[PDB]
Amino acid sequence: ASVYAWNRKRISNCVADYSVLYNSASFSTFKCYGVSPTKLNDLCFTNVYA
Amino acid sequence: GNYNYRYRLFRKSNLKPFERDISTEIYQAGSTPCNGVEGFNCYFPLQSYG
Structure with missing residues (x-):
């Protein structure tokens, strides 16, 4: 997508x-x-925004 | 900008109490070995304050 309308x-x-x-x-x-x-493979998070 | 003061951002394990490590060895942050050569995931352990 374009930067001004970045997909989340x-x-x-x-x-x-x-x-x-x-x-x-x-x-x-x-x-x-x-x-x-x-440490990304060890920690836990609620959700990830990409 | 005074850069004469340097701190170690990267190390493979934590230091012992009252232990001084002055080794300027390249750091392997990734799967590809560095063999003492800078590059991708091969960063110098010492970085200077701005």
Whole structure:
């Protein structure tokens, strides 16, 4: 989608394997400002907005 | 901007009490090994204050 009308994807009621997304080499930018990248597979959150 | 003061943002494990670690070794934050070479998920342990 376009930036002025960015889609908001809600991720909930499921298990997320952030290691698979993290280890992909095509991602040239992976910057987390409130959490640790290696702790994403251990922490739990109510819902995720994408 | 004074950059003479540096802090260690990344380490593999926590320090012991009254332990000084001055090692400038590259940090493996990802699945791909670094082998002492900077790059993706291979960040310098020392960062300077602004």
